[PDB]
């Protein structure tokens, strides 16, 4: 391999694909992970009839396209659509040949062995990549934060995961998962807005509600006090202009929606909140490492971008953990990209050149070589 | 009493002056 060939990094969250080169400070492309197909034949006479659309090209034509998400709760369910997304990433977003650059792909924790083998097969046979690697999203986020010991609470668009790591050892027995993320939060926001009087029923209006969530929602430090303040005053309300020019008012919903991460009872899920899940993971971890796991609590994922979420997590983990454990929540400003940042760091590091799975190793050991080379 | 010039080192000059 030529030392002048930079490796590619691809983070495929439940709702966003981030692709870039190893060594860059930010991903060069960040596009929604969706595949759109025409609803009726003949509706695209003169604009170019493509059998499928990917990314923003399909997001803009959502009005005339049926959209599918190949990644559900961080797990790939449509391999054809995932291959299409990877093709769009390589030939359209990055505009490079995958057979000329290594590929470091991110995966959610506890990824099925069959899914790992299928990804390896797709990368070695369809794109003919010279080498590749598979890395855990939480481990990459921790490396981007610049640590090897700590607990990462990575909440994407489809799933959240509390992953403890010691010297890079993502401890499987202590990893916890929660089927609650930006998608369910957007659904809850739609529900509460319909309750308030703003009814959103279409998939396009769902995107407006998602934008409202990303822009106006925030995590409150004290939910009861915030509810009391919202009921006794309108200072917590905000205005939002819809695409048609109508100005709506968002009130307590701003902090009632993100509150579902700490109290899934609002959505009806018999599961502990994110703080309680992190605490239970640190408990399942060995006692000798709980001090470092508390001291190096890192936040990752797009869902963790709510203002005040770090202070709320700090408060909750300090109230739940022993008084002798120093709690410290780490929320980098660019935590939404920590996954890709750590992937690029690991792909650019020289000592990592011996970790890649080569085409020869693949042809010799089958797709199962992932279970020996990626951990 | 010195017979050589004090141009060899500012540190030596500072030491001599502090001693003075």
């Amino acid at each position: 391999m030529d030392d002048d060939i930079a490796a590619l990094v691809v983070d495929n969250g439940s709702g966003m694909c981030k692709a870039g080169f190893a060594g860059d400070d930010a991903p060069r492309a960040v596009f929604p992970s969706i595949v759109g197909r025409p609803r009726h034949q003949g509706v695209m006479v003169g604009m170019g009839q493509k059998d499928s659309y990917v990314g923003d090209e399909a997001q803009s034509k959502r009005g005339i396209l049926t959209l599918k998400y190949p990644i559900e709760h961080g797990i790939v369910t449509n391999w054809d659509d995932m291959e299409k997304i990877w093709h769009h990433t390589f030939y359209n977003e990055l505009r490079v040949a995958p057979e000329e650059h290594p590929v470091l792909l991110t995966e959610a924790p506890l990824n099925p062995k069959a899914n790992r083998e299928k990804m390896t097969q797709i990368m070695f046979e369809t794109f003919n990549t010279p080498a590749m690697y598979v890395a855990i999203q939480a481990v990459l986020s921790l490396y981007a934060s610049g640590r090897t010991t700590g607990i990462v609470m990575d909440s994407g668009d489809g799933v959240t995961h509390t992953v403890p790591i010691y010297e890079g050892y993502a401890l499987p027995h202590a990893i916890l998962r929660l089927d609650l993320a930006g998608r369910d939060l957007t659904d809850y926001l739609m529900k509460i807005l319909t309750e308030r009087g703003y009814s959103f029923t279409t998939t396009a209006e769902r995107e407006i509600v998602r934008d409202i969530k990303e822009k106006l929602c925030y995590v409150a430090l004290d939910f009861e006090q915030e509810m009391a303040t919202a009921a006794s005053s309108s200072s917590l309300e905000k205005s939002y202009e819809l695409p048609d020019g109508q100005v709506i008012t968002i009130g307590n919903e701003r902090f009632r929606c993100p509150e579902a991460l700490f109290q899934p009872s609002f959505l009806g899920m018999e599961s502990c909140g994110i703080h309680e899940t992190t605490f239970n993971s640190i408990m399942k971890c060995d006692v000798d490492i709980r001090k470092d796991l508390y001291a190096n609590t890192v936040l990752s994922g797009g869902t963790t971008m709510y203002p005040g979420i770090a202070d709320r997590m700090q408060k909750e983990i300090t109230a739940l953990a022993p008084s002798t454990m120093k709690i410290k929540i780490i929320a980098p400003p660019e935590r939404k990209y920590s996954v890709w940042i750590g992937g690029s760091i690991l792909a650019s590091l020289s000592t990592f050149q011996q970790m890649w799975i080569s085409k020869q190793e693949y042809d010799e050991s089958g797709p199962s070589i992932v279970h020996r080379k990626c951990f | 009493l010195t017979g050589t010039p004090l141009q060899n080192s500012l540190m030596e000059l500072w030491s001599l002056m502090h001693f003075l």
Partner: protein, 180 residues
Amino acid sequence: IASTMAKDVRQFWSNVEKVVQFKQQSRLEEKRKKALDLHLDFIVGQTEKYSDLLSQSLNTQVKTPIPLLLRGQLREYQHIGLDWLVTMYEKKLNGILADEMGLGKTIQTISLLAHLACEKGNWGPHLIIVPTSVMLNWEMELKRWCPSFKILTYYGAQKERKLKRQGWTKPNAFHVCITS
């Protein structure tokens, strides 16, 4: 595999901390630089102010004559240096004589001692630390020019040094001590 990963990440963050250390060292050098430059102007200004204050009382013309203790005449530059040393003493400052070798700095210091002894009544215990090669030279120059100083050459084995120190604390036991 995870230990290799941890080692790689630890090396990377060691590089990051090295960059941070370079930054902090650059900031300290600035503080070191301004601290060095700032006190330089202070110690310099103070020294120059003290020298200017010292040159303010000069009448320049030499005020001190050849003291009575000298048996021979002093050269012109030697007399000027003697007057300068006497002024330094009167104004309570310490002196550095950087006259080129061979100009009689020994004679100038001996004349300073002569002045202090004759006009100021101070014949102290006057310590003189010289190289071992010139102790005898200093002793002979003192015996030659100023014969009134009690000279004590501190040399010899430990026992001889103890014998010489026996009773040396008494007043007027010696006027000038010469050591290495």
